[PDB]
Amino acid sequence: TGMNLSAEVLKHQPMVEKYARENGISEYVNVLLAIIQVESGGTAEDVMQSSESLGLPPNSLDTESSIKQGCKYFASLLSSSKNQGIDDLNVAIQSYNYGGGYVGYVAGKGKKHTFNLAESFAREKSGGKKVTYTNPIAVAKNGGWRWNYGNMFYVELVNQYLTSGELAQKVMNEALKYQGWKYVYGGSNPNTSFDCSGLTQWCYGKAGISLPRTAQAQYDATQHLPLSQAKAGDLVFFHSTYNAGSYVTHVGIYVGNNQMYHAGDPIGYADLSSSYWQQHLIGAGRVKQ
């Protein structure tokens, strides 16, 4: 059963892309963000829970050192895999939780990760000791338990977060170039940075849709619909966010699953389920195509 990454995790994406690039694993940014989600939900200082991989006490690293170490550690597990003749990504993902010894274990037993191999490795390392594990995946599989070592369901947990139209894709491919950028009032291009309506105008403009300059003018130019009927690529509008002369004071890009991408300070994803965003929500608007 597939799931969506939280805004708390997604805020770490520019930093994750930086260190993934430095370790030659830019194609695995999605896996690295799924690991953060599973490990800390993006709210712990050590976001990747990579302190133990550096032989340090739990939660010793700061956020930057955590992403640096997590990326470096995951890159070493992929290298260890390649060197032992393993092509399977799931071996590197399970070894993030189990340690590099799971690579060697799998290399001599078929070169592929299987739930049965993950289960046998944990059974050996635990000394045949069980512990309660009430995650619905474990409940449905064996009643709700695991062998007392690492997490034998780790691959499946990470792959829950690794499961939109053409307009949404073009708008977001442009918008994500400015993730973590400082909000600039009156900004409508990459040379000045952007404000909320400046970001939507530029990115939709790159997708071939001509939008007016203001959040209010953008609201007036769209077909309105409630957020419950909205899709990724629709705009989401807000009232009274600051002292302004118009009804609409803020605009964002709806990205589905009750979340948006906006400017935003820094520019990025926001969870719409917070009390604040619910109290300012007008609804959504569909652009003319």
Ligand SMILES: [Cl-]
């Ligand atoms: Cl046993």
Ligand SMILES: [Cl-]
């Ligand atoms: Cl037991």
Ligand SMILES: [Cl-]
């Ligand atoms: Cl803002």
Ligand SMILES: [Cl-]
């Ligand atoms: Cl329009």
